[PDB]
Amino acid sequence: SQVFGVARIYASFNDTFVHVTDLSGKETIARVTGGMKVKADRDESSPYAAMLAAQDVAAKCKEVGITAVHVKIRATGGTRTKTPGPGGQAALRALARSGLRIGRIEDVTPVPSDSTRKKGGRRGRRL
Amino acid sequence: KFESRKIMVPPHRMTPLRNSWTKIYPPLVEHLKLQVRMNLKTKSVELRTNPKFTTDPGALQKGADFIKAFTLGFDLDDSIALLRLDDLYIETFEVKDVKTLTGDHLSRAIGRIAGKDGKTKFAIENATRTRIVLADSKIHILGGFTHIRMARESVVSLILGSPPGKVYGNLRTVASRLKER
Amino acid sequence: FELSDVKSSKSLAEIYEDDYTALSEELQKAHSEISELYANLV
Amino acid sequence: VVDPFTRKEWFDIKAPSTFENRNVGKTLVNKSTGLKSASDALKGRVVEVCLADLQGSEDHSFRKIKLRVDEVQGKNLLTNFHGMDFTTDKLRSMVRKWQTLIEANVTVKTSDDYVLRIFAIAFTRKQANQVKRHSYAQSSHIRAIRKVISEILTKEVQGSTLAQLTSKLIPEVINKEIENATKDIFPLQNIHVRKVKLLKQPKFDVGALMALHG
Amino acid sequence: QHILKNPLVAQGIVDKAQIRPSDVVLEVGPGTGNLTVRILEQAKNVVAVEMDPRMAAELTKRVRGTPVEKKLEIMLGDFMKTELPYFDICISNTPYQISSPLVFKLINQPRPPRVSILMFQREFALRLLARPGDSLYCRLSANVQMWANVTHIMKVGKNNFRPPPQVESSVVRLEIKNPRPQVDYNEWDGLLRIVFVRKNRTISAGFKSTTVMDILEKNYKTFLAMNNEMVDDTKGSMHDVVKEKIDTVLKETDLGDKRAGKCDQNDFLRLLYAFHQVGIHFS
RNA sequence: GAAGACUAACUACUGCGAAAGCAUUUGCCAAGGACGUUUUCAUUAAUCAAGAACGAAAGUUAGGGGAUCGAAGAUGAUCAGAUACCGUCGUAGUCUUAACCAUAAACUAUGCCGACUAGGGAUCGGGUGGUGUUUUUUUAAUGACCCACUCGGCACCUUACGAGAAAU
RNA sequence: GGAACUAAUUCCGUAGGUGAACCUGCGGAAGGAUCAUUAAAGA
């Protein structure tokens, strides 16, 4: 029915990436993030910003020749947090209600058959 | 002009949700106007949006979030809150994320979050207006962003092996400085 | 103010509604009981 | 002062002949210019489409396919097989607690000498009357299962030219012959190919690629 | 901030300072002024250096109206950032954390104090006075020791405080060497720093580190640029040619298999000379 | 695309080892307990000063390796506080070979061998018994499962006709 | 400078240390306060 592209949302903490590409991936179409739509460092991840970046992305998305899109949501991953950032579901919620018909969305956070020593040491990191 | 979102249902949380099902699907289909099918054989909930009966495009996305919230072992009332208030989000992390713990060390760690008779776990939610789920190695949080960030720091302080008292201190500190504002 | 360990009966949707919506609702009902008792005493 | 969108030319991607729907998706390139052209860029791209979007039927929600572009002909670029994956969400649900997981794999050749490594996973199921919840096989069990799976997989790969394996995987006959030779060792549930990758393809041969397309 | 609950201890520190009636005494960290009041009666002047403005105000109040008030000067602020006047002797009771920078500020002060009596931690103080052949012996020991001789004077148990500290506390005396030996401080420290990072590991092991070879080569190339001495073509990495030059120096002086943990001040002076004479400097 | 480390989820304090310890997979090499046993030898044994084999992390010698994390060292700012005392660079080290050291709350904070005294349901391994279940093909044979029993395991439950200052 | 005018948690082993009232890395111990849910091959 529509013209399909790929949404692909990387939502870590301290920032959230939204950017749509051609269904193959090789050629992209507009990006914009949460760090872009506010200036305060501390407020780089928050849903409020992602919503704004969802808004910008939706504009250019339909500005070229895309009408619909499948999303591939994703946390940091690797030897890092493994859990979805705040402004990723909020970045998808603001992208869902924008006309761009969605379809089939899986998680793609890189998960290892574990290893490479995590950072932090025996004491560990964030507190 | 349809839309189809399909969410898998966990077997452990499958029985309570199916039992309350009769309390579950009516607020969706009736209050939000939505199609809620349920495949028992595939254990998958299917949320479809009808253009004629759906006023808001976001409601279909909201319905999927509500099903997932209950999926994560949260209460039906907590799931209902997600539809009612937008500002409510869920955060999930692995104990192995914050501090690599083996065997009993992990076990005890979990207890420091729960506490005797849930007392340690209940205090954090009340002072942070949130809902927490203590699964296996996964912990889930449900509530406002500003509320969740304070709650996550308190939970992490516990998982780092800090004594419960200290965490009570930080807890009433934060709850005071936020309920004041 | 002291945080209460006992589980809050009010749900997250319910607590937000109270914020969305005399000195205190519990304290005034303490004051209203206790003046009805004092006039009985007098 | 340029705008990338107002310069590229829209292209059409067509799936292999042995599929439910030939049409797949559209892509952006860059005008076939003298010195650097639109012809070169299109040839090396691949596309991951869930075959349920590619077969329609939903009893196929998982299982993703790699379609690689090899040849092009004016607003019409064809594709062939490049691999198969599962979906991450489906795989996570399958790994239930208190049950043995079993995987096995082999690198094996076809007729039209593509070389591939195919995968296979299965889990010990509970006997429908069984009091004990764990239902774990016995390593000796596991060893035997993998050797038979390995046996069956090598038989299918050598017999299949390349496209035939494709025609073999879609109705999942493999999945069942496994269960059949297996049920004499130990129960088992799920049992899927899970993942297949390509690592050595022969040579272009423009003739063979055209035959697959209808 | 802790206080000395032992009133019969300050007297021993004051005795070991060997006050003359003409002395200017620098007191660093006077606290509540327990030592200050006693020092004022025996010296010509007390220059008290205190970080806390509250403690400085209380100290002025304590001596106020006494006949020795006019012999107290209070310098307010961080002693590290203070330009210190002339003083004959020093007494310290400041926080242990500063103690480390503070010692080298005292040693490098222009005209060094004739004598000093300082309160440090049990481990720090033991390091200051440690000699070669000792496990504690380290950079601090030898850095402090070449400049001046340090004597460990009494042990002070934690219970003699209010509140009491966790680690045990002592009092070491430091007398600046006069005149100090004519060796660049940077040159002496650079050679000493590389060997110690692993006292047990031989000198040749300490000088085979990539970073150390790079440093010594760069400095040899600098010396040769200064004196117009040509360097033959290096077959590959420069660090390999400098490796031969470092190993020849260590073999020539007998130091290849020696360790910092058992090397004295004369051993380090001899090794430093042997590298310097060959055009290799550590600064 | 390269390098080196590691073995997540499954994971179960179960399962194995003298203990340290041992978790991708496959091949090879030798080893072991328990069980079965109308086999064999026939007192060959128990425990052990001296003496000896092994032994976690760190550390040491000589090579290699040196991704990561990171004693030392150098730094960041130090605000009202510290309820939320860390952040950065990073030497040794972390890995491996050949050799050292030779001790840990090396802990069940409980010598070894044997023998007697009391109940219960689970589970790991082995074996025996069944016109048990399920797998279909044409019934079987297999396999997985169910019931009863029996050796030997890792544990839990309840109690005493027992013990303790009491937890037990 | 002069002279007018206006205005007004504990601990162990090990290693190292110059902002070391002691701390820090690696590995151990507890002699440290378990709430809640739990048949979903429920073919």
From Swiss-Prot, chain A:
Pfam families xref list: Ribosomal_S11 (PF00411)
Bias (Basic residues): 118-127
One GO cellular component term noted in the UniProt record for this chain: nucleoplasm
GO biological process, one term: ribosomal small subunit assembly
GO MF annotations in UniProt: mRNA binding; structural constituent of ribosome
rRNA processing as UniProt keyword: yes
Sorted UniProt keywords: Acetylation, Cytoplasm, Nucleus, Ribonucleoprotein, Ribosomal protein, Ribosome biogenesis, rRNA processing
Name used for this protein in its record: Small ribosomal subunit protein uS11A
UniProtKB/Swiss-Prot annotation, chain B:
Spans through the membrane: none
Signal peptide range in chain numbering: none
Subcellular location: Cytoplasm; Nucleus, Nucleolus
Keywords (A to Z) from UniProt: Cytoplasm, Nucleus, Phosphoprotein, Ribosome biogenesis, RNA-binding
Keyword NAD: no
GO biological process assignments: endonucleolytic cleavage in ITS1 to separate SSU-rRNA from 5.8S rRNA and LSU-rRNA from tricistronic rRNA transcript (SSU-rRNA, 5.8S rRNA, LSU-rRNA); endonucleolytic cleavage to generate mature 5'-end of SSU-rRNA from (SSU-rRNA, 5.8S rRNA, LSU-rRNA); proteasome assembly; ribosomal small subunit export from nucleus; ribosome assembly
A single Gene Ontology CC term: nucleus
Primary location recorded for the protein, binned into one broad class: cytoplasm
S-S bonds: none
GO molecular function: rRNA primary transcript binding; unfolded protein binding
Domain KH intervals: 103-155
Function description: Required for small ribosomal subunit (SSU) synthesis. Has a role in the processing of early nucleolar and late cytoplasmic pre-RNA species. Recruits DIM1 to nucleolar pre-RNAs. Indirectly required for cleavage at the A2 site of the 20S pre-rRNA, forming 18S rRNA, and at A1 and A2 sites of other pre-rRNAs.
Subunit structure: Component of the small ribosomal subunit, ribosomal RNA processing complex (SSU RRP complex). Interacts with NOB1.
Name of the protein in its database record: Pre-rRNA-processing protein PNO1
Lineage of the species this protein comes from: Eukaryota, Fungi, Dikarya, Ascomycota, Saccharomycotina
Originating gene: PNO1
From Swiss-Prot, chain D:
The entry's keywords: Acetylation, Cytoplasm, Isopeptide bond, Phosphoprotein, Ribonucleoprotein, Ribosomal protein, Ubl conjugation
Interval of the full protein contained in this chain: 20 to 233 of 255
A GO term for molecular function: structural constituent of ribosome
Classification lineage: Eukaryota, Fungi, Dikarya, Ascomycota, Saccharomycotina
Superkingdom as given in the UniProt entry: Eukaryota
PTM text: N-terminally acetylated by acetyltransferase NatA.
Protein name, entry field: Small ribosomal subunit protein eS1A
Keyword Ubl conjugation on entry: yes
Origin species: Saccharomyces cerevisiae (strain ATCC 204508 / S288c)
GO biological process terms, semicolon-separated: cytoplasmic translation; maturation of SSU-rRNA from tricistronic rRNA transcript (SSU-rRNA, 5.8S rRNA, LSU-rRNA)
GO cellular component terms, A-Z: 90S preribosome; cytosol; cytosolic small ribosomal subunit
Subunit-level organization: Component of the small ribosomal subunit (SSU). Mature yeast ribosomes consist of a small (40S) and a large (60S) subunit. The 40S small subunit contains 1 molecule of ribosomal RNA (18S rRNA) and 33 different proteins (encoded by 57 genes). The large 60S subunit contains 3 rRNA molecules (25S, 5.8S and 5S rRNA) and 46 different proteins (encoded by 81 genes). eS1 interacts directly with uS11 and eS26, which form part of the mRNA exit tunnel.
Protein family (similarity comment): Belongs to the eukaryotic ribosomal protein eS1 family.
Localization of this protein: Cytoplasm
Note: Present with 92400 molecules/cell in log phase SD medium. There are 2 genes for eS1 in yeast.
Gene name of this polypeptide: RPS1A
Swiss-Prot record, chain E:
PROSITE patterns on file: RRNA_A_DIMETH, SAM_RNA_A_N6_MT
Residues annotated for S-adenosyl-L-methionine binding in this entry: H2, L4, G29, E50, D78, N93
InterPro entries reported for this sequence: KsgA/Erm, rRNA_Ade_Mease_Trfase_CS, rRNA_Ade_methylase_Trfase_N, rRNA_adenine_dimethylase, SAM-dependent_MTases_sf
Keywords: Cytoplasm, Methyltransferase, Nucleus, Ribosome biogenesis, RNA-binding, rRNA processing, S-adenosyl-L-methionine, Transferase
Origin superkingdom: Eukaryota
Subcellular location: Cytoplasm; Nucleus, Nucleolus
UniProt EC number: 2.1.1.183
Catalysed reaction equations from the record: adenosine(1779)/adenosine(1780) in 18S rRNA + 4 S-adenosyl-L-methionine = N(6)-dimethyladenosine(1779)/N(6)-dimethyladenosine(1780) in 18S rRNA + 4 S-adenosyl-L-homocysteine + 4 H(+)
GO CC terms, sorted: 90S preribosome; cytoplasm; nucleolus; preribosome, small subunit precursor
GO MF term list: 18S rRNA (adenine(1779)-N(6)/adenine(1780)-N(6))-dimethyltransferase activity; RNA binding; rRNA (adenine-N6,N6-)-dimethyltransferase activity
GO terms classed as biological process: maturation of SSU-rRNA from tricistronic rRNA transcript (SSU-rRNA, 5.8S rRNA, LSU-rRNA); rRNA methylation; rRNA modification
NCBIfam families: ksgA
Protein function: Specifically dimethylates two adjacent adenosines in the loop of a conserved hairpin near the 3'-end of 18S rRNA in the 40S particle.
Family stated for the protein in its record: Belongs to the class I-like SAM-binding methyltransferase superfamily. rRNA adenine N(6)-methyltransferase family.
Protein name stated in the entry: Dimethyladenosine transferase
Gene transcribed to yield this protein: DIM1
